[PDB]
Amino acid sequence: HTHRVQIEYCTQCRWLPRAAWLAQELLTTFETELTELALKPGTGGVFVVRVDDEVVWDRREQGFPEPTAVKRLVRDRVA
Amino acid sequence: HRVQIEYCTQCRWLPRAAWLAQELLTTFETELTELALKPGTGGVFVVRVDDEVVWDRREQGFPEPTAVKRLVRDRVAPEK
């Protein structure tokens, strides 16, 4: 466990459940490479995934975080 | 306010850890800066609030939502 992942979801948009889901998807696939995964309540329309402080996925740029797509971008950062 | 949940990875406790995270984040969304899930060793299941352990499985058993939410409110901000 050496890398950290963070998911910032828009709280008002009731996106906690999908954030939680993604957290489970990522933690189950990268449990051995992640030191921890954090959920950060966000402002409005916000839904971003960060790996080691670096943004890897932004909703209003790449759309909905499809598991596969986002898991591939997260893996590259933890080859 | 930062909360952390360390669950035993080998025990396949990710799902229950994720559930609790949702329970706590939905009740304390306005008081928490973030809630983290930390994969743990064996049989481990503890909840921490501001680095302070508030719930430990092999001491208080399964993290019943109400019980644990009350202890978390106690650290964060004692309201109803």
Cβ atoms of A34 and A1 closer than 8 Å: yes
DSSP state string for A12-75 = TTT-HHHHHHHHHHHHHHSTTTEEEEEEEEESSS-EEEEETTEEEEEHHHH-S--HHHHHHHHH
CA distance readout (Å), B6 to A58, B3, B78: 27, 10, 24
Using a CB–CB cut-off of 8 Å, the residues of B that contact A are 4, 9, 14-15, 18, 21-22, 25-26, 29, 32-39
Range of the domain at A73: 1-79
Give the one of A28, A34, A39 whose C-beta lies nearest to B35's C-beta.
A39
* CATH code for position B9: 3.40.30.10
What is the amino acid identity at position B33? T
How far is A41 from A28, CA to CA, in rounded Å? 22
Using a CB–CB cut-off of 8 Å, the residues of A that contact B are 1, 6, 11, 16-17, 20, 23-24, 27-28, 31, 34-41
Number of domains in chain B: 1
